Design a protein around this ligand. Structure first.
Ligand SMILES: NC(=O)C1=CN([C@@H]2O[C@H](COP(=O)(O)OP(=O)(O)OC[C@H]3O[C@@H](n4cnc5c(N)ncnc54)[C@H](OP(=O)(O)O)[C@@H]3O)[C@@H](O)[C@H]2O)C=CC1
Length: 332
C-alpha cells in the first residue's frame, strides 16, 4: 500500500511513522514519480526534532506537525505526466531534487525538479548525487569559481556534501585541505587527501597557516558555525578569499563579514532558495555534471542502505553522524 512518512509530534525520532497516502493525479505542468530510494538529509533530522518550526512557518506554510513531510531528493520512475510537460514520459528513470515529500510512495512535482539518471549507474548509486553534488557544484563553481592550483578547505568532509566537494575539487585540480573526526581520518587520507585535520577542534586554523606560510586558503566550503568556527575560518582565508557558507543556521550577515575582512567574497546560499529564483538551475548544473558521471570521472558517494521498515534507525544513524558519505532508504 502507498505510504507517507509523518510524525505526530516533534522532538523524538521514535515517532516517525508510515501513514496511509492517498492517490494523487498529476495536473497541468506536473509529473507523478514512483519513489524508489531516498537519502536522509541533515535537515530531515532537524525537522524531526522540531528545530526549524519558524523557518517552516515563515518560508513555507507549515503551521503544525501534521503538515510536515520529509525528503528533499530521491530517485525513481515516472508513472504519470500531466499536460504541458514535453520533456518527460512514463518509464523515464529520474533523480528528484528539491521536493519536500520524497519519503512517500509517490510524489507530484514539477518537471523542473527532475533530471535524467545516468544510465550506467544503479538507482541506489544515483541516489547519492543530487543534493551533495548540486550543492558542491553551485558553491564551488557557480559562486566561488574555483580554479586549478587554488587551495580549498572543506569542513566535515566525511558527510554527503563534503564528500561531493572533495570529488569536485580534486577533479578540478584544486589542492584539498580536509577536516573530519578522528575515527574517520584514515578513510579520508585513503581517499586521496594529503591534508586531513580535525573538524571537531578549532586548531585547524593554526595548522593551515603553517602548511601554507601564512597564505591560508583561497576557498572555504563550510557548514560549521558554532563557537568560534566562523572567525577561525576567516583567519585561514587568503586575501580576496571566497567563503561558501551552506549552514543556513545562525550565520553572519554581509556587513558583519565586511567588518572583519573587506577583501573576501561571502557566499551564503540555500540551494532550494536558488531554484526558487531560477527554476532552470537544476537543469543547468546537471548539464555540466552528467558527462563526468558518464565518463566515470565523478563517482557515486560511499553509502549505507536501510530498508524503509527501519526508517527510525536510518535517521538515528545519520544523527550519530559516524557515517562517511550517504545514508539511503529503499522504498517498498
Ligand atoms: N545550503 C544548502 O543548500 C544545503 C545545506 N546543507 C547543510 O550542510 C550541512 C552538511 O550537509 P550534509 O553533508 O548533507 O550532512 P551530513 O549529516 O552528511 O554531514 C554532517 C557532518 O558534520 C560533521 N559533524 C558532526 N558533528 C559535528 C560537530 N559537533 N562539529 C563539527 N563537525 C561535526 C560530521 O563529519 P565529521 O565526523 O567528519 O566531523 C558529519 O559527517 C548540513 O548542515 C545541511 O543542512 C546540505 C545540503 C544543501
Amino acid at each position: 500500500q502507498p505510504v507517507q512518512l509523518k510524525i505526530a509530534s516533534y522532538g523524538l525520532l521514535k515517532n516517525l511513522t508510515w501513514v496511509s497516502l492517498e492517490n494523487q493525479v498529476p495536473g497541468v505542468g506536473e509529473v507523478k514519480v514512483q519513489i524508489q530510494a531516498v537519502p536522509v538529509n541533515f535537515r530531515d533530522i532537524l525537522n524531526a526534532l522540531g528545530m526549524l518550526q519558524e523557518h517552516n512557518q515563515t518560508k513555507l506554510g507549515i503551521t503544525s506537525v501534521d503538515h510536515l513531510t520529509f525528503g528533499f531528493e530521491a530517485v525513481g520512475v515516472i508513472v504519470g505526466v500531466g499536460l504541458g510537460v514535453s520533456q518527460w514520459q512514463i518509464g523515464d528513470e529520474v533523480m528528484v531534487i528539491g521536493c519536500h515529500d520524497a519519503f512517500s510512495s509517490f510524489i507530484i512535482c514539477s518537471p523542473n525538479n527532475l533530471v535524467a539518471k545516468p544510465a550506467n549507474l544503479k538507482l541506489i548509486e544515483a541516489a547519492t548525487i543530487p543534493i551533495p553534488f548540486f550543492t558542491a557544484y553551485h558553491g564551488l563553481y557557480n559562486l566561488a569559481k574555483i580554479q586549478s592550483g587554488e587551495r580549498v578547505l572543506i569542513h566535515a568532509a566525511s558527510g554527503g556534501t563534503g564528500q561531493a566537494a572533495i570529488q569536485l575539487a580534486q577533479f578540478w585540480g584544486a589542492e584539498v585541505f580536509a577536516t573530519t573526526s578522528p575515527q574517520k581520518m584514515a578513510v579520508l587520507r585513503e581517499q586521496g587527501i594529503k591534508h586531513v585535520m580535525n573538524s571537531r577542534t578549532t586548531e585547524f586554523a593554526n595548522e593551515i597557516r603553517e602548511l601554507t606560510q601564512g597564505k591560508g586558503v583561497d576557498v572555504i566550503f563550510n557548514s560549521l558555525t558554532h563557537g568560534e568556527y566562523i572567525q577561525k575560518n576567516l583567519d585561514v582565508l587568503a586575501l580576496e578569499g571566497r567563503y561558501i557558507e551552506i549552514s543556513k543556521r545562525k550565520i553572519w550577515s554581509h556587513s558583519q563579514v565586511a567588518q572583519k575582512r573587506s577583501d573576501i567574497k561571502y557566499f551564503p546560499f540555500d540551494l532550494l532558495e536558488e531554484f526558487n529564483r531560477d527554476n532552470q538551475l537544476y537543469y543547468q548544473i546537471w548539464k555540466k555534471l552528467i558527462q563526468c558521471f558518464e565518463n566515470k570521472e565523478l563517482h557515486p558517494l560511499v553509502y549505507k542502505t536501510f530498508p524503509n521498515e527501519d526508517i527510525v534507525e536510518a535517521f538515528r544513524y545519520l544523527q550519530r553522524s559516524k557515517h562517511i558519505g550517504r545514508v539511503v532508504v529503499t522504498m517498498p
